[model samples]
Target chain A: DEDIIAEENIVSRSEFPESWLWNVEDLKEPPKNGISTKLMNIFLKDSITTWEILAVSMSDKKGICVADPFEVTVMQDFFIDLRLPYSVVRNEQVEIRAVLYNYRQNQELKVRVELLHNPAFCSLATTKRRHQQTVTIPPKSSLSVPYVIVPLKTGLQEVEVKAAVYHHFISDGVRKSLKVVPE
Target chain B: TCNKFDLKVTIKPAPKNTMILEICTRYRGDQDATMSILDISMMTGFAPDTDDLKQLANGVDRYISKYELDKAFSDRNTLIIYLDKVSHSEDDCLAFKVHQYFNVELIQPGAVKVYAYYNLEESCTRFYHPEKEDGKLNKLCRDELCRCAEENCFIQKDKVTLEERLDKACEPGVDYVYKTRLVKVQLSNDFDEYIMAIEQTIKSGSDEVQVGQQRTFISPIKCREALKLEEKKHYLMWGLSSDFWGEKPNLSYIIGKDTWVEHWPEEDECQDEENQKQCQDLGAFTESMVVFGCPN
Candidate 1:
C-alpha cells in the first residue's frame, strides 16, 4: 500500500520569484519599506527538544542556497562551561567537536578543556584547561575532536573547555557546555 | 479526516540479500500526498533509542524534506512505506495528513493500502527528486535503497544528547537524525533564513548585508575566503541528494556530491573535482554528519 507522497518543491528564498516576500508582507501587513527575502541555516542539538531558529529579526532580505561549500578555520582558543562536577581519569578528558551545516565532513580543531562546578551562567566555580591538538578529518565528512582532561580533582565540580580553530570564525565566540561524572 | 486509517508496512527490495530492513511509504495525491522512509534495523531497532516511538516519529520529518503532501495532494494521497508490518496496533502506525503541519496525527481513510518493492532507499529518493537534472543518477533508485551499508547512507543521530535518552552508551550522530525530525517540522524553510541572518550577524554585525530569510550553499573557495582562512586538509560536508521522504529534506538538507573543498587551477574542472581526485589518489570523504537533504 503506497501512502507517502511527494509535494511541491520549496524553492529557497533565493530561488523564489523575488515576489514572495512582497506577497507575505501584503498578507501580513504592508511594511513601511519594501519587503525582501533571504536564506539562512540553523543547527539543532537534540531530537525531542524543539529546534531553535537562528533568531532572524523582522528586518532582513532574501538569501541564496549555493552549491557545495567548504569553510576553513585556523586554530583559535575558546572555552567550555561544564555545569556539573566532572572528572578526567588517568588519561581520559572531555572533548568537543564542531560541525557546520552538514555532518559529512570534519574540520581539524584545537581545544582547551576546563572544568567548572556550581558555575553561574556567566561564570563557573572552577575550570580546567587542556593542551590543543590537531586531528585530520576525512574528506567530505564530519568528525569530533576530543580533549582528554586528566587528574581531575574529586569534589562537586564543573568543567569548561574552549576551542579555537586555526582560522575559523563561526566558533570564535562559540563555546560548548556539558555535564560529566569522573570515572 | 477519519479516526481509523489503513497502515501499510513494506520493505524496499534490496540488491543483495542484506539483513538491513528499511521501510518507506510513498503517497500519491494532488495536494496532500506525502512520501516518507523509515528504516528499522533488526538488531539495532529504530535509531536514537531503538525502543522509543518518539525517536521513530521522523516519518513526517523525512516526508516534509521532499514534498508538501498537504499542499500538493488533497485526498487520496500516496504514502510510500519501507517498513515491515510485523503487526498493526492502535498507535503503532503513523500518518501525515496535513500540509506543512506536524506532531498532530491526521485522521486516516478506510481501506489501508500497503505495497512492497525493491530498493526502498532508492524508491524514496526517486519519489522525492522525480526529475533529477542528470539521467544516470536516476538509476540509483530501485525499490529499496539500503544495499550498501559501509558508510551508513543514512545514520541515526549526529550527536548524542539527553541524559535520559542516553540510558545506553551513546554514540555520536545517532541523535543527530532523530533531533532533525523535530527541526524539520518546526523550522521548515524558516531555518534557512534564520541561519543566513545569524551568519551575517556574527560575521558582519551589520544589518545592511541583507541576507534575508532563506538558506544558501556557498562555494568551497568562497567559504574559505569568508572564513578568512586557508583550506586545510580536513573533512568537509557535502549533500549527495536534496530529496528526502517524498520531496527535499527540510530540517537537515543534503549536499550535492559534485562539490568539494579544494582550489583548482581550472574552473571547469571544479564540476568534476571529486572524480578527478580519485585518479590522483586524493583522499575523499564519503560520509557526512552535516550535509543533509531538504524537501523539494
Candidate 2:
C-alpha cells in the first residue's frame, strides 16, 4: 500500500507559512584542505526588503573560523503574476487570473494591465484577441485580476501579460507558453 | 592645517527594491600628523563568502613604519600636535552623500547594519587622502621621526563601533520601483498544476552579486567566531573594484557611488550542478527600461 509520506499534516483550515529565513546546513567533516562547498536549491519568502547571511565553523585542528559573510538582494519592483494551469485541452475554456503585487511605499501605483493579443488563443469573455484593465494599487497592497480564455491550437499556446505604470517610464511584462492538448 | 574628523552613517528603507544610505566622513588628523583613510562597509540579510580570493587585482595594500618613540610635531605653526611616543584623535564634519540602492519586494523583512573599518594608520604619523589630497616627503635625518605611508581594514568583534548616520535620499533623476511576485509557473504538459515560482533566496556569497547603480560589500574575517551573527542577517556588502573580484564594469568602487544592488538571487539554484532550477521556465522577455528587474 502506497500510504501518504507519514509526514503529512492532519490539521485542516490552514495555509503554508511564508518563508522568512532561507536555508541552513552543516558539514561535520570538511575537506582536509580546510575548505568545502555544497550547492543548494533555494526559494525566498515574500517581504519587500534586503537579506543578510553569516557563517561560522569550528574544528579541533583549526579551532574556529568565520568567513566574511555575504548577501543576496531580490528586486521585484512590480510584476504581473500569472496563475496559469500547466495543461489544458483544446477548445476548453480556461479561467486564469493575473495577480499584481505592489511593494512601493508612500506612492499609489496606477498601472495598465494587459493580456497581449495572440492568434493561438481565443478569449472566452472578451471579443478581441487582447484585454486591458486599469487598476490603482495602494502602496503595499495587491490586486487579483480575472481572465478567461480558450486555446485555439493544440501544441503550445503562448500567453503574454504586461503591467505598465503611468507617468514614470516603468513597466513589467511576461510571456509564457501554455500546453494545450487535443480532445 | 586640517584638524577635524566626523564619521557618520545613516540608513532608511523605501519601496521598489530600494534602500537609502547616507555616509558622512570628514577630514584627516591634521595637527602635524598622518591622516587616516576611512574604510567604510555595510551589511544586510546576505553576508559574505570570505574563503574566496580576498585581495583583488587593484586591492588596497599596506606597509609598516619604523617608529621613533619620542617625537614632537607641529602643522608648520605653533600648534604643537605632539603626544610623545604616545598620540592620537577629531573630524571636521564633512559633506558627502552616496547612492546605495535596494529592491525585490516579497523581500523577507531582513535586517541591515553598518560599520566603519578601523584603518587609523597609527604607525605612520603623516598621510592624507592619496586620491584627493597629496603632500611631499623629506629625506631621512637623525632628529626627524620615522613614519609609514600607512593603510588598514575593519574588524567585527571589538575595537570597532557601529555609528548612526542614515538619512533618506534617492537618485535625483533616476526613479525606483519595488517588484515582487508569488506565481505558479507552468510545468511540462504532463504535470497538471501550478509550479510555484522559486522566490530564490540564497545564502549570500561575495562572488555572486554586483548589479545596477547599487553597490554591496562582503567582510573578510580572520575567520574568528568572536561574533556569532545570524545567517539571514542583513549585510550591505561591496568589494574593491578589481579584476580578481569586483571589476569596475561601469560605476565602481564604494568611495562615491550613485547606485547599488537590486536583487541578489535574481534566481539561483541549489541542485545538482548538472540539472538546475524551475527558474528556467519563467521565460525571459524585454521592456522599456533604463533601470530594471523581474519574475513570472
Candidate 3:
C-alpha cells in the first residue's frame, strides 16, 4: 500500500541543536611500527546520533591509504522521548503525546504507553487516572500515544509518561513540565 | 576539546549546467599539526576523495612541477598548502601556508561531504621538513568523499611516511631549466643526422653523471623538463644525466613543453639580475654535489 503508514509515524529530528562531529586530527608521526595512539579530552556536539569516523593515511614512501570506516552511535534503545508544545495557553486544547522509541536494530517491540495526567486540568475520552494505549514498533522505530488536554491551570503543567514491554514487565518512564500561559 | 573546524560553504549556481561550490573551512588545532587540507564528499559520498587531504598531506613536497592536480574541478584544483603547518610544536600555535581558497567547478550535484586529513600523528614533526616541504603533489573528499582521478585530496591516516631519496631530491621546480654539454646538431634530421655521428662511448662506463666525457643526453616526453636545442648555435648548458647502459649514443636533445631553459644572457641582455643570484646559488649547490658526491 502506501509508505503513508511509515510517513505517518513520528521520527522527529527536532533534537537537532548543533554540531556532532568530534575528531582528533593531525596525530604525530607514528612510530616505525606504523601504529600510534593518543587520547585527549574534548566536548562533543549536542546531537544524539551515530558518527562515522574515518582513518586514512599517506606515506611519502608508502603512498596513500584509507582505513575501514568507524561508526559510533550515541543513544538509548528503550526510553521515553515524550514531547509537547513547549508553551500552550490555558484552556487551549493541546495534544500531549508520549513517544516510545524501540531502538533495537531488528527487534519488534509491543509497548503499553500511559500518560498520567491531572483530570480537572485535562479532557478528551475516559476521564480516568491513566490514559493508556498499546502499539507495535518495528526495529529501530517509534510510536506515540496521545491525550488531548485543555489546560485549566496556568504555568507549569506537570506531565508524566511511562511504558512497559508487553511480555517482559520491563518499564521506562519520565516526567516533564509544559508551560501553560494565561489565555 | 577537539580541533574545531569552521565550515563556510558558498554554492554558486553555474551560468549554464555548472555550479561553483566554494568550501572554506578554518580550524584551530593542537597547534602542533602541519598544513590542513579540505575537499567535499558524499551522502557524505557527494563523496569527494577528500582530495586536499591527500594533496596537502604531502604537498609540502612538489618540486617536480606536475601541472595536473587532475582537473576534476579546474586546473587550479592543485594542492592546498593550508593556513598552518609548523610551530604547532608548542602544540596549538601551528603554521599556515595555503594559497588562500581552493578554486574549482561542479562535477556532481550531491552525494558528498568534505574532509581534512593530516598525517602529523607522531613523527616527521621534524626531519622531513628539511627533506620535504619542497616536493609537488595533489590534494581531496566527496559523501564520505569519492575519489577524484587526479591530484588527490587530504584525509586521516595510520601513518604517512614518504621515503626520501635521490629522485625526490631531483624533482625540479616549475619553469625549472637545466642544460648540459652542448654540441650543435640538427633535431630536424630526427632519425638520421645526429646518430650519423653517434656510436660515441667508452666500453660500459657504468658511472652515470660522468659518462666518458659524453656531452649529449636524450629526454622523454613524460619528464617535466627537457633540453631545447637549436641548430648552428654554440650553447653552454648544465643538467643532470641518466643511464645509457651498454647502449650507444643518440643525437640532439628532445625538449618537453615547459621544461624550462636556463638563460645566461649575452652582454646586451640586461635583465635577470635576480636570476643571476639563483644561477650562482645553483652553481654552488652543483659544485657541492659533484665534489662531495651527494647531499648530507
Candidate 4:
C-alpha cells in the first residue's frame, strides 16, 4: 500500500460581525424637484423676502424679482455640503429650466442655496440673503426638491445643514467653491 | 656519451593452443627499440610421432604469457614478460617450454642478448571475400600462422592479449571504418604460470577423461592446484592483419616481415647456441616486410 503525505497552511476569511460593514443607508437622499433640500436649508433665512413680500419689496415700481415657483428643483438624488456658516436668500431663478451644465453624467455636482445679510447691499430690490447651503445631486433621471420654508426672524442664526448624501458627500474641496448665489 | 645495457626476456605459460611470449629491452642510454616477428620453426629434436609435439606445444602455449613489458626510463630501460593462460596456475612452464622448443639452454643471471623476434598473432588478418552474399570463411590460415609463430619466435607480448579480455573501438569516416580491439596483458606472478599450466594439464588429460568431463580452471589458484609441469605442443594464431586493401601478396608479405625480424638480434637469447647460429645466419634477425596501403 502507498502512503499519502499531508501538510497545512493559512486559510481565508477573518472572523467579524455584520455591524462592521460601512453602509450608505444612514445618509440622506436628494429631494425631488422644487427647491432642493440643500437649497432650502440655506435660503430659508430671516431678512429675506418671502414670495409675496419679496415681490412687494422689489418694485422699482412693482416689487422683488422672485422666480415664478419661488424655488428651484433638481432631478436626481445627490449629496450636499450643509456645514458652511453664511446667509442665503433667493431673489430669482436666473435661468429657469436651464441646464446646470456642471452636473454631467459622471461628475459630482452642487446646488448652492444662499441668504443675504443686508438687502441694501444690492442696488436693486432683490431678495435679502441670509444663510446658504449647497446640495449635490447624483446622476439620475429624476429628483425633486424636498423642503420649503422662510426665516421668521434673523439676527445671527446659526446657519447649519446636515450634509446629506444621496450618492456621495460634497467633498471638502468642493464645499469651498459652492456659493449661495451667482455673481 | 654511449653506454651499454641489457635486454630482459622472460618466458612463461600460455593458453592451451597459444603461448604468450613477452619481449622488452633493459638498456642504458636512448636505444632505438624495434620489434617484429621472426621465423617460426619447430623444435629440432622432437620426435614426429603421435601427438607429443602437439601436446608439448600446447603445454608451452599454456605456460607462456605472451605480453612483454619494457619500460623506458632515464637513460635506462627494463622489459619483463609475465606468463599465463586464460586463467592462471603455478605449474605453467612456458619459459622452460620455450627453451625446449628452441632447443636452447638458459644461462644464469638470465640470458641478456641482442637479437629478438616478433611473435605475430595469426587472427589479425583474415580477408574473406565471396562471390555471393552467403560467404563462408575458413580458419585454416589463422591456424597456420599460429603454428609458424609458435615454434621459434620473437614474440612481443608488451601489447598482447593475456586473458582473452578484449576492448573494441571503432572510428567511422566517410570512406571506411577503422576498428581496433585490444586485450590488456598483465604481468602478475599469480597469472604468470597458473593460467597456462592448468590448461596444459587439462589438455594432457584429454585422453583420460571423456570429452565432456573436462572443466575450466577458474582462477590462478585453481589452476595451480591442478597443474602439471609437462611439455605439450599447442596451436597459437599469430598476429593477423586482414588488409582488404593489401598492396602485396600474403606469403611474400609474411616472408618479408620475417626477414625484417631476422635483423633485430640485439633482444633475444644470443648466447644460446642455436639462437647464435640463427643470428649469424640471418644477419641480426630483425628484417621485416612493409605492408602499406591498408584500407580502413
Using TM-score as the measure, which candidate wins?
A: 2
CA deviation > 4 Å runs, candidate 4 = A1-183, B1-3, B16-18, B31-112, B115-296
Worst 10 residues of 2 chain B by lDDT: B71-80
- Candidate number with the higher lDDT (2 or 3): 3
List the candidate numbers ranked by TM-score, top first. Answer: 2, 3, 1, 4
Q: TM-score, chain B only, every model?
A: 0.16, 0.17, 0.25, 0.15
Per-residue CA lDDT of model 3 for A57-103, tens digit only, reads 67686687798987777666777766766787665444445667787
Error of 2 at B219 (Å): 71
lDDT of 1 at B272: 84
lDDT string, candidate 4, B1-296, tens digits: 11222323443444412233332333233432233121111111111211322343355322212221111111001122222221111211222223221222211111222322333222011111111011111111231121111111212223222112111101121111111111221233222121111111111111232322221111121122222212231111112132111222312112101111112224356577755664443321111111211224
lDDT winner between 2 and 4, please give it: 2
Q: Write the per-residue lDDT of candidate 2 for residues A1-183, one digit (tens) a residue.
A: 022211112111111133344445666445666666766666754333456666776767777788886677756756666767778776544445567888888777877777665556654212222245556777786765645455667787777667777775556665566788876
Instruction: For residues A28-60, write the lDDT of model 1, one tens digit per residue.
Output: 344356644444342322121122222223433
**Of the candidates numbered 1 and 3, which has the greater TM-score value?**
3
Fnat per predicted structure, each in turn:
0.00, 0.00, 0.00, 0.00
The TM-scores, one per candidate, come to: 0.17, 0.26, 0.25, 0.11
Worst 10 residues of 3 chain B by lDDT: B123-132
Which ten residues in a row are the worst by lDDT in model 4 chain B? B123-132
